[PDB]
Amino acid sequence: TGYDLSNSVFSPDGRNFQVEYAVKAVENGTTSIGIKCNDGVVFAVEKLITSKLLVPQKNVKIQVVDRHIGCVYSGLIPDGRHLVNRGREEAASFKKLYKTPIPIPAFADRLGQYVQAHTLYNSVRPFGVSTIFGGVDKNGAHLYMLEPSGSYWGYKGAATGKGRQSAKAELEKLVDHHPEGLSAREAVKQAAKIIYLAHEDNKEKDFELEISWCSLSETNGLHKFVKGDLLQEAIDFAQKEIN
Amino acid sequence: MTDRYSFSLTTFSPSGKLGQIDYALTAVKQGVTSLGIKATNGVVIATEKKSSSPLAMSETLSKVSLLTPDIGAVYSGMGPDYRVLVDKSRKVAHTSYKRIYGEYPPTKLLVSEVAKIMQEATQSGGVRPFGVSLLIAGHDEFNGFSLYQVDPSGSYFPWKATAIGKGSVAAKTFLEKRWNDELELEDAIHIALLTLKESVEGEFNGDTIELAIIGDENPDLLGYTGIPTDKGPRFRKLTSQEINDRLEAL
Amino acid sequence: GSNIELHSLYTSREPRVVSALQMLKQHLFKYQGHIGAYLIVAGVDPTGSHLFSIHAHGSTDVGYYLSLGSGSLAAMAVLESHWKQDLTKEEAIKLASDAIQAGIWNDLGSGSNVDVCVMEIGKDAEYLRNYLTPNVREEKQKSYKFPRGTTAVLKESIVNICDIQEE
Amino acid sequence: NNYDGDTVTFSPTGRLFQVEYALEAIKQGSVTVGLRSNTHAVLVALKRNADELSSYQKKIIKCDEHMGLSLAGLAPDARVLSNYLRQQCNYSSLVFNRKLAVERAGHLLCDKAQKNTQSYGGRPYGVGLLIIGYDKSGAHLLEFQPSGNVTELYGTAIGARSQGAKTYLERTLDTFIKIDGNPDELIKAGVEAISQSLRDESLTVDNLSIAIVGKDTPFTIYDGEAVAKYI
Amino acid sequence: GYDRALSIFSPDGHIFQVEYALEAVKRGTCAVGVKGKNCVVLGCERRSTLKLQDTRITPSKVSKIDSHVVLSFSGLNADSRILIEKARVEAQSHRLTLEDPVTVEYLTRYVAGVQQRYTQSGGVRPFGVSTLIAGFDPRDDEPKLYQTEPSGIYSSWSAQTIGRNSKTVREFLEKNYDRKEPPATVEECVKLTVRSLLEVVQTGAKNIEITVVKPDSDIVALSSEEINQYVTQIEQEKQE
Amino acid sequence: DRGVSTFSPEGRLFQVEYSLEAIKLGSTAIGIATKEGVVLGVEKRATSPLLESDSIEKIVEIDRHIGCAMSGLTADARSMIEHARTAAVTHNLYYDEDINVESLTQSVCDLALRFGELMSRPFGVALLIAGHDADDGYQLFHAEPSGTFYRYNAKAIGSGSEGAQAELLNEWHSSLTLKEAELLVLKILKQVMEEKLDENNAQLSCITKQDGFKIYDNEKTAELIKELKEKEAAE
Amino acid sequence: MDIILGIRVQDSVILASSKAVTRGISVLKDSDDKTRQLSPHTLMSFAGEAGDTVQFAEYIQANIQLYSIREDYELSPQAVSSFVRQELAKSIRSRRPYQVNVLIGGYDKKKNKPELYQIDYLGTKVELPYGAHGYSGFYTFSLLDHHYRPDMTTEEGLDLLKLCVQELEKRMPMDFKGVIVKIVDKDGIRQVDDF
Amino acid sequence: GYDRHITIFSPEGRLYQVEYAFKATNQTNINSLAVRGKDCTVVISQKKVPDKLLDPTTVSYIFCISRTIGMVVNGPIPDARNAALRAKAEAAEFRYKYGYDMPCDVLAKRMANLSQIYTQRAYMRPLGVILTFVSVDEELGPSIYKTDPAGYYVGYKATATGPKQQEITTNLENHFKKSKIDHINEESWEKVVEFAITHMIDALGTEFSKNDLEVGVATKDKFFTLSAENIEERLVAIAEQ
Amino acid sequence: GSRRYDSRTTIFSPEGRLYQVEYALESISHAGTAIGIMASDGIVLAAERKVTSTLLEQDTSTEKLYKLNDKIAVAVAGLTADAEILINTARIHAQNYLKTYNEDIPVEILVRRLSDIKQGYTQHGGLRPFGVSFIYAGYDDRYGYQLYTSNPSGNYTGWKAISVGANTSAAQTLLQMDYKDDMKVDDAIELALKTLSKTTDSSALTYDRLEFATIRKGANDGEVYQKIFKPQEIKDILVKTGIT
Ligand SMILES: [Cl-]
Ligand SMILES: [Mg+2]
């Protein structure tokens, strides 16, 4: 034993226990989801209201990369911010050299390689976040989810955090009941519902809903936050479904 | 990041032993048998092509390697370590010698350079020793034919004949009885094949044995004509057919 | 040539002309023409037969016939007059040496003898040092061998070239 | 236990103990309170002395004309982080002729603290900060933790016995937020809030430290007889 | 580069590596320094376990740093060469920039500063050496004698000893050395230095080295016979 | 083993806390600030009678208006003093003025936590930095290896610190004269010292606006010791 | 032109160096000693660009004195001259070369022979019976070609040197304000106070 | 027992971190197979999409390194992509420096040397992957070269990698014992892919749908992967005889 | 991080010893014995090769005696590979001195330089020390014939006669017994071989198990010659002295 004391050490299983311990930090975090729709993607996240003293709508969790990519994550919030800062540098250098905005699969690997690099040495710690991200590019809509190991895949729907099992079950129903696809405005409504349903795992403290989206028709392929009437419409739809 | 292993991973123990070097020698002991014999007019080096799978093409894996036109090398121990050493050995023969003096280094000095590289892996920061022992056969104008052994420590010794790896203890005894100072090259090849048969279990033929010589100059292998002083490489790898011909007269 | 040999050993393949071409031009380009090397590179490899020229600034050119140096104009005049497609080995050697002769006779920077190298496919390359020798010095009218003792000397001494001796 | 030797090591439950131990240093530190209205933002800090001959350790640091913070924990670490903020506020002014946003100031602190939690050799910061400021979107109050977590709040408190002041502010939320165009009453609410965290000792003239920033009010610190008014 | 912190504090507030360096000094051969009214004498022990030695070429224990200052030591011999070299370089550097040779106090402060630096620098261990630095300042007739140690602290001494069994010879010097009236002559000073070593040395043959330093760059090392005469006179007076 | 910049479960840096233990083993140093000046006094503590005590330099000048006393691993203080002197002189070069005592102290304390795996460990010495400037007048600071500095009306550091600090608690008042402070340092030093206090094993110093920083002669201190003995015998 | 001369006789080396220091239109000093003692039996005179001359001489002096202390031994004049040459040969391909010419006069105690070395700023070393740097050689070399012997005494060497200085004072355009003369022999280095 | 944490020798002369990297290779529970035709080299690999929420098009362990070279990986995807990106960079650099396309065997050697360095240098860990490179080389013809965490590499007539590699290996061994040749004597690559799939079915004892497999094909001057519909056409032909 | 695996090669024990230096000396104590004897008219270097084989090519072999320059040579005891690193450094140092001062390097200066390099590995860098002990045999015009030894600690000392490697305790006692100051080279040759013959762990001392060298002024007039003995020449001197 002692194989779990240092990062980048293979155990006799062939496992990196330090990365597996980073996953525990992710599982401890709040719920966040992603939904791939007809011509874009929708992101949503659970924000726990620790106290009345928290200013509503101010502590924003979802982050934009470039102008067409959205990023949300569960786990250690600072680690997620560090990853997004890197993502922004990666996207900037891509656009600098190649002119076109970075494609989503291309962007996904840039994060993947960077996270994977933090499993190669004992002088660094793995990332304590699973990141759900995506957007619209020349080839259409893309949704991805990236783990502490550096592992990522494309997704129809994605979920992580403390209420991931509840969310995953809800996402699986949508995939089955909508083979032809889901619209952007529908996805926002469904996203709200799923976060509310996933909140049963964090039911002690009340929460604040935060949604964003990229859509070719609704947002011209740019990342925007869901605000005002459209946000309230999604909250009402979500509240109606739980009752 | 940064390589933060700037300290030695090989250190003296209370008994005065250098553990990592001893353990590297143990890895060499497990390795497949290889040998070298020196004749009056040449040198022979040989080893078994231990194929990991019958689907694998064992011709693509070269255990016996040309370092210079007149110097060859064979090993016992960890194959990957050997492969990188051959790369470095080839390069150092150019950078530290040929690009300075306009000619290939003599056997002993190339061996000295390889030995240096292996010593540094025994003392430098954040590295383990090489897990191989090399046998380097070669020829040069002023020293003639020569055969050297190089160990993980960086120590090297000249030999009339020797063996390393799996069945080296038995093979060295076999060579002591057969070796004399009047051997011709063909006689040394014959003795090499006899010695190597003892350590091999399965098939024993040109396809499972790798054998090369340092002998006469080969103008046919030079690739060009017109310069009298350039007479061709003394290193030659024996073909599968050439080995089988000598196995009939065995 | 050194790096090509090491490359050939690494790859277990015979070297290609385009590899030497690429390595040369990238080296020369890096030094911005300060390495004054103007080369004609030729050879045969598994891909076929090749002929290139290299300028000191790093530009390369492809051709069936090329000439470089101070006598390149004298040589190219011959090549442009006598070159044709589908030349034989014997016709090409003649054309090449004729082109060099044009330079030897007409260019002051060129002279003496003609060296040749033939690189044919599926064969060893033959280097023909002093293929032609049309400029041998005529016999001198007189011998200038001096009478021994003609030169005035002040001192003599043996020089010790040997190492330090035993005993 | 076995996973608290350095900051580069997760525990089996996904915890970073060196960060948690750094968080502990804040709890040992003296209490400090932060609160704001729509027009002004106030910092109130209980200063601590070594003994009767000693001075009372300063808790509040000015970062710019429109921004500053109060500290709780390792004071030298607060000096490093406040110096960084001073430079960042200054870079924004010199290059962009732009006063640094309080939210963006929080983001910069978060990212600086984070690098110290993921790399070998270094250590987390051992201090918690309460940043107040007035920018183009009005008054702001931030809470910085050396884990990297930064939070925008109406009011808060950090340090020893800070739970008492935090509960008071949670009750008074609706009242003190409405205190617009009245600095003295907003400070009164802050002084009354920090009083809920006191035991044995009371607020004296060289014990109390107050700072304020607002609409037409540069970041200024009040100490000595300047705070006798509020005792 | 190798950056590892080798010299560090322990729970009881000790730097063990610095303290273990003092144990290396305790193992080293005894060295003694005594200053008279117009001179300083440096005595040194030579362990007689090593015979068949070539005393012409063997590194002498007392080293000249400049023409007016000398340095002896106790502890690791290899370590002492590094300090001596640095000290010699600084002595010439001082002459070059200040146009005046170093004071004995300055040279001591430099050597002590080097020793200190090695107690809080990454990747290095402390020097296992304590030194006795003696001499006369330029254009000054007041004798100077300083001591340094691995930690980096230094101080001036009327008389001092370092090395193995230094506790015994310090005991001797504390009762025999009078501050109000120090050794007035060279003879008296050398005699007291030899006497102090004879408490520890064993045989008074080739085991005692003596070096006398006088004002105005007047440094001389005594021979075997010259020292043997002191050894003879001391014991003949003792037989009473 | 373990990191040099490691936090304990209580939220303290191991190495900093251990360096504080080394300072407790050091010789006593006392500082007293008054409206007529600041007095600094130290215990020399010679290890042997053959050691020439006047070479023991535990009180040190930083500038004409700033002095400094030390306690602990005194060898570590040399680089701190060198930095302080450079900072003081450099500021005068850049600004044509004396540097504030607090600003000088802050500059010294910035070195404190520059250790890791920069220097390999914290300083094992505490400093009493005393001085005067036009803005804040006569001041006394206590600079630790934690990087923290407190201002003090009076302060004792070293082996007899907590016993001396309790004595300074009672004796100090805001109307102390310089002469009264001098005797008070001598009184408390004599109380906590192992060996009997005299002019050779103890040293006094002061900083005034007029004369600047001055280390006292052994003849001058001897008279103050004699003056102390008589006034204690007076009641 | 900073006149520096050197003559090697039977049992000693004699160096003569001008006393004037002229900066522009004014003679700032008329008693300047353009030499440094490298070791008890080795003396180096120098001439070249302002500042560089002294900086170089003192740098060499420091290095030789360091060697003497380390080894408790005096380097031979030949060894010192080779060290000096290498420093100048290193210097000439530097960013800013030392613009200094030197003469090294020494007495080798091992061989019991005087030795004179002439080294220019490029690092060009030659051992000579007599030498000079700058324009002085244009007058003195031919004069010494006529009057020199290897078996001359020190007194004859000084008379021969007076003849050089008289010629320089007659035919050179600058007033170099006379010379400081120093003798290097078995007993060490001494200055001739009346010349 | 720190000789099991970093890449230094144990008393037995073993590198335990290298051995444990070999075990990580099978973590994905996927089996791959590679065979050579006359004009082509075919590589097939099992495809497993357990989650319904996954976009199955993005789930892949086959990589297009260069126009001519393809690579299948056995091991975790992060290490797989790490190796893929490096191989792509190396292949591109090679073409720029030496003026011709990097051969399959040379790339394999280069990646093997990089792997060797991780077994010797302490600060770098081995990658828990086995890399199988395939191409139709312009000199050597159809080529299969495989690299592992030890830094070992060799050419192959055919090969298999994964948990059930031995079953596939013996199945292939027995076929080449009958035919007595070093390749699949077949003109079209379509039939070579059919051979590969057929012999994997026989060895593993499992039937495959179009979404259960992943196929890569190397021909002269290009390497390409088959779509689900291209594989379906392949499965239909197998069933009809 | 990496700290976990650091052996800390450059630290003191509680007793004030350098662990790695002490263990390196333990390694050297198993190495073949090497002896140096200094006489009035020259120096002898004798050394024993370790358990050789009949198939070892002796005439082209060199594991013990190495040439640093024309005036100085060394006998090695310990790791040969480590020794060659230092030997090549020493060879360069001698040439640097010659280029600078145009004189051959004094023996002590060369010895001090190598000894300072060894010292460095014990004080800083975190690397293991060189497991090598040298016997330096050399000549210069200042001190004449000189014998020195250096060990992994970087400490060096001068000697009239000295041994390193295996059985030095026994070897030093025998040398101390029969050595005299007015001794000559031919007598020193005999002493060196007789000492090895008694201290050897082998059954008998033969030519194939020895390396031998002399530094003599026995060169034509005032100059010094180095003689590295050939196998046949070692065989002859063994018969002459009456050992075989
Ligand atoms: Cl490579
Ligand atoms: Mg010249």
mmCIF file of C-alpha atoms in Angstrom, chain D residues 66-143:
data_model
loop_
_atom_site.group_PDB
_atom_site.id
_atom_site.type_symbol
_atom_site.label_atom_id
_atom_site.label_comp_id
_atom_site.label_asym_id
_atom_site.label_seq_id
_atom_site.Cartn_x
_atom_site.Cartn_y
_atom_site.Cartn_z
ATOM 1 C CA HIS D 66 -12.947 53.030 -4.516
ATOM 2 C CA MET D 67 -11.952 49.654 -3.008
ATOM 3 C CA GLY D 68 -10.399 48.012 0.058
ATOM 4 C CA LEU D 69 -10.586 45.026 2.413
ATOM 5 C CA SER D 70 -10.435 43.760 5.995
ATOM 6 C CA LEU D 71 -8.392 40.701 7.010
ATOM 7 C CA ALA D 72 -8.622 37.755 9.417
ATOM 8 C CA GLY D 73 -5.793 35.219 9.804
ATOM 9 C CA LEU D 74 -2.155 35.494 8.702
ATOM 10 C CA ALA D 75 -1.558 39.237 8.277
ATOM 11 C CA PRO D 76 1.495 38.832 5.994
ATOM 12 C CA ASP D 77 -0.631 36.800 3.545
ATOM 13 C CA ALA D 78 -3.183 39.648 3.542
ATOM 14 C CA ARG D 79 -0.344 42.049 2.721
ATOM 15 C CA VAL D 80 0.623 39.887 -0.280
ATOM 16 C CA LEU D 81 -2.966 39.605 -1.567
ATOM 17 C CA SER D 82 -3.788 43.285 -0.941
ATOM 18 C CA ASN D 83 -0.578 44.253 -2.761
ATOM 19 C CA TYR D 84 -1.749 42.126 -5.702
ATOM 20 C CA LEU D 85 -5.143 43.873 -5.694
ATOM 21 C CA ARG D 86 -3.440 47.275 -5.550
ATOM 22 C CA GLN D 87 -1.445 46.339 -8.672
ATOM 23 C CA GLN D 88 -4.512 44.969 -10.501
ATOM 24 C CA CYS D 89 -6.621 48.027 -9.643
ATOM 25 C CA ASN D 90 -3.670 50.096 -10.827
ATOM 26 C CA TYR D 91 -3.159 48.183 -14.086
ATOM 27 C CA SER D 92 -6.846 48.744 -14.906
ATOM 28 C CA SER D 93 -6.451 52.513 -14.370
ATOM 29 C CA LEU D 94 -3.151 53.028 -16.217
ATOM 30 C CA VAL D 95 -3.933 50.856 -19.264
ATOM 31 C CA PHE D 96 -7.722 51.177 -19.687
ATOM 32 C CA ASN D 97 -8.421 54.391 -17.715
ATOM 33 C CA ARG D 98 -10.984 52.223 -15.942
ATOM 34 C CA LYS D 99 -11.747 51.601 -12.277
ATOM 35 C CA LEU D 100 -11.533 47.869 -11.568
ATOM 36 C CA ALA D 101 -14.897 46.163 -11.021
ATOM 37 C CA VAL D 102 -15.313 44.627 -7.547
ATOM 38 C CA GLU D 103 -16.641 41.392 -9.080
ATOM 39 C CA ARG D 104 -13.584 41.153 -11.348
ATOM 40 C CA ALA D 105 -11.319 41.905 -8.368
ATOM 41 C CA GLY D 106 -12.850 38.864 -6.654
ATOM 42 C CA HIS D 107 -12.234 36.716 -9.739
ATOM 43 C CA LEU D 108 -8.542 37.698 -9.771
ATOM 44 C CA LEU D 109 -8.099 36.831 -6.074
ATOM 45 C CA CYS D 110 -9.845 33.478 -6.578
ATOM 46 C CA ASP D 111 -7.476 32.522 -9.409
ATOM 47 C CA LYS D 112 -4.357 33.639 -7.500
ATOM 48 C CA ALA D 113 -5.294 31.579 -4.432
ATOM 49 C CA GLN D 114 -6.188 28.547 -6.587
ATOM 50 C CA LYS D 115 -2.693 28.151 -8.098
ATOM 51 C CA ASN D 116 -1.291 27.686 -4.580
ATOM 52 C CA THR D 117 -3.703 24.768 -3.914
ATOM 53 C CA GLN D 118 -2.854 22.651 -7.000
ATOM 54 C CA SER D 119 0.969 22.937 -7.135
ATOM 55 C CA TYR D 120 3.674 21.123 -5.151
ATOM 56 C CA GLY D 121 6.119 23.049 -2.943
ATOM 57 C CA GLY D 122 3.920 26.061 -2.200
ATOM 58 C CA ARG D 123 1.141 26.465 0.363
ATOM 59 C CA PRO D 124 -2.393 27.888 0.516
ATOM 60 C CA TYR D 125 -2.924 31.432 1.775
ATOM 61 C CA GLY D 126 -3.733 31.460 5.501
ATOM 62 C CA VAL D 127 -6.104 34.419 5.526
ATOM 63 C CA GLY D 128 -9.722 35.373 4.799
ATOM 64 C CA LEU D 129 -10.652 38.743 3.309
ATOM 65 C CA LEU D 130 -13.769 40.915 3.181
ATOM 66 C CA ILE D 131 -13.607 43.221 0.142
ATOM 67 C CA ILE D 132 -15.894 46.257 -0.125
ATOM 68 C CA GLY D 133 -16.111 48.735 -2.999
ATOM 69 C CA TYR D 134 -18.185 51.143 -5.077
ATOM 70 C CA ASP D 135 -17.982 50.776 -8.876
ATOM 71 C CA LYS D 136 -20.199 51.436 -11.941
ATOM 72 C CA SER D 137 -22.853 48.966 -10.685
ATOM 73 C CA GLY D 138 -23.072 50.467 -7.178
ATOM 74 C CA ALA D 139 -21.956 49.149 -3.786
ATOM 75 C CA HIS D 140 -20.453 45.670 -3.354
ATOM 76 C CA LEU D 141 -19.281 43.317 -0.607
ATOM 77 C CA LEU D 142 -17.207 40.178 -1.246
ATOM 78 C CA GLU D 143 -16.013 37.336 0.998
#
